Amino acid sequence: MDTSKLKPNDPRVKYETKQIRGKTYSYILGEPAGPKLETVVLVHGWPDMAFGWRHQIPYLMSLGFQVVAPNMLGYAGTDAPRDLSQFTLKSVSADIAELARSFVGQDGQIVLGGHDWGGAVVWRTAYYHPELVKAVFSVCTPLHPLSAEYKPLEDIVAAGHMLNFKYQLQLKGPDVEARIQGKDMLRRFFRAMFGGRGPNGEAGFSTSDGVHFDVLDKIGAPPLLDEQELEYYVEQYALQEAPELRGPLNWYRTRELNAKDEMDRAKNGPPLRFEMPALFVAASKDNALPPAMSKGMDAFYKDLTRAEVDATHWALTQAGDEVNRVIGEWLNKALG
Ligand SMILES: O=C(N[C@H]1CC[C@H](Oc2ccc(C(=O)O)cc2)CC1)N[C@]12C[C@H]3C[C@H](C[C@H](C3)C1)C2
Structure with a gap:
């Protein structure tokens, strides 16, 4: 299959909605080339949308992954509830868990990746839903400790x-x-x-x-x-x-x-503690999320892989090929 980035209205993927925890969630669904090895859920940040993963989605599909990239709460075709409690990391993590299990079954597991606000989401999702998250990665966004x-x-x-x-x-x-x-x-x-x-x-x-x-x-x-x-x-x-x-x-x-x-x-x-394989991809020139902010974060992980890419905040696209290979190589190690 072609692995070049998704274009707008790209035909290689499906565009669907599901009711999830009382909200309409819209998402991009990419089916795997060859037998499905894993399902990867990808979580964008602000002011982005599922299409922000356009470089990663076909690449992961070509490796045998089913890819589910939702427009997150408030964005694009997804509902924007009035109630701010729907926008907490915990509630959105539960949305992700239900959406993910609507594909892999309640007993299934996923690879979970995030960028920006989505990176904050996926660390919390792996914390709130360890039963579900087999491997987790964040681009740009390091771990922040539980707010005391x-x-x-x-x-x-x-x-x-x-x-x-x-x-x-x-x-x-x-x-x-x-x-x-x-x-x-x-x-x-x-x-x-x-x-x-x-x-x-x-x-x-x-x-x-x-x-x-x-x-x-x-x-x-x-x-x-x-x-x-x-x-x-x-x-x-x-x-x-x-x-x-x-x-x-x-x-x-x-x-x-x-x-x-x-x-x-x-x-x-429980304390913040990630037993599953984790990957953090820093971006050299991100001025909101500089690599230095990830300083004390390794102590919370049994199995954290670190990488850095030479790009601004918009690393998924500006460094899409390099980000793809960092993720792909880590998945080789993390899943096998
Ligand atoms: O604010 C967040 N992202 C914005 C995204 C857009 C960027 O603006 C840019 C970036 C680049 C460029 C350019 O290349 O010209 C222009 C404007 C500024 C920051 N992300 C969070 C993610 C978590 C949770 C919370 C606190 C902290 C950690 C950062 C929000």
Whole structure:
């Protein structure tokens, strides 16, 4: 089979929905070349969608894997509940567990991979559902420990800490949700988020201040999406009810809910400990998720493989071939 990246509306895969824990979940389903060896579930982040795995999906199919890549809660053809408790890592992990078992059966196991917010999801899924997850990998996103405390991000950055996360204040508030509505604004947003620049090279997004709305009308073509890829992101995001970014931005509105879930697990529940094979792929030039942030993470794993790829945040695509071979070689070791 052709292993080149999925194009928009690619015919090598199926596009389906299933009811999952009270929500319509849409996903990409790729069937294996040859006998099915494993099922791989792939979890994207923000502001991405299942199509963000376009380089990995046909590659994994060619190796004999069934691939299920959902549009996560809030995104594209998937429901965007009003209730923020649906957007917690624990609830979305349970969604993933039910969706995965709808393919492999309740007794089955999966390989689970994530990027960005999806990487945070898959570490929690392997923690909440060890019965299900045979092997787990994350691109860019390292492990964070179980939250023992909750402090508003406002106070954290006001104290001079976690300043590379300050854009999340803007994302969780009203401004992006209110201003980025409709296809034409979504297109400008995606030009910014995938590397487009203004007439004098100004960025459309920063980790300090978030989306730079005044740059958006003059932002040029993104280097990390071709024109039809850009338009597919616009079209798919436009499936959401106005305001279209409510669902995706709800992921930044769960800090307190997630903390409450995990302060519990951190006192009664089992410790964070991954006995199954795990892979962490860092990205050299990710300024939100720099490799240095993964420093103390190996102690939580019996069997963690580390890799680094020379790419920005959008490593699945910009370094797609290298990421593919890191994953494929690790799976050779992890599954056999
Ligand atoms: O915020 C998160 N991703 C955004 C994705 C888009 C990027 O913006 C970019 C990136 C690159 C470019 C470019 O190449 O030009 C432009 C804009 C900024 C960060 N990810 C999380 C994932 C987990 C959970 C929570 C906290 C922490 C760890 C990071 C969210």
